[PDB]
Amino acid sequence: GPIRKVLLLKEDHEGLGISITGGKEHGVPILISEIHPGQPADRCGGLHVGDAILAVNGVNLRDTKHKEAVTILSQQRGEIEFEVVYV
Amino acid sequence: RLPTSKI
Ligand SMILES: *C(=O)c1ccc(CN2CCCCC2)cc1
Known part of the structure; x- marks a missing residue:
């Protein structure tokens, strides 16, 4: 599907x-x-x-292991822009 | 059945 940016x-x-x-x-x-x-x-x-x-916030989550992605996502603060897509 | 995390 279409890639969306979501704040x-x-x-x-x-x-x-x-x-x-x-x-x-x-x-x-x-x-x-x-x-x-x-x-x-x-x-x-x-x-x-x-x-x-x-x-998320320009941090590429591709090829991250589960825990690495969790860490990155948990650290973002305030205004958090997601790049998301349904496939 | 995948490991799941909450953030
Ligand atoms: C989910 O069960 C859950 C949501 C929020 C919190 C509180 N915690 C506070 C410090 C920064 C992240 C959120 C705990 C569990």
Whole structure:
């Protein structure tokens, strides 16, 4: 599908509000598996279960192992631009 | 069944 840029805004006491699966060791993309109620991803919209995350704030998430992607995603602060796509 | 993380 089309690659979309999706902006999420959050404060430092909040998480992104997503669960993810996948990564290089699993041969599958970093995929959103859950959007959690009331948290930034749910409020801001634009991110959906089944979306693959290709990059966040210009940080390429391709070929990352699961834990490396989790670390990168968890570190982004404030204004967080996702590059996402459903395939 | 994949390992899942929450962020
Ligand atoms: C999900 O279960 C969950 C969401 C938010 C938090 C709080 N934590 C605070 C510090 C930065 C990230 C979010 C914990 C668990």
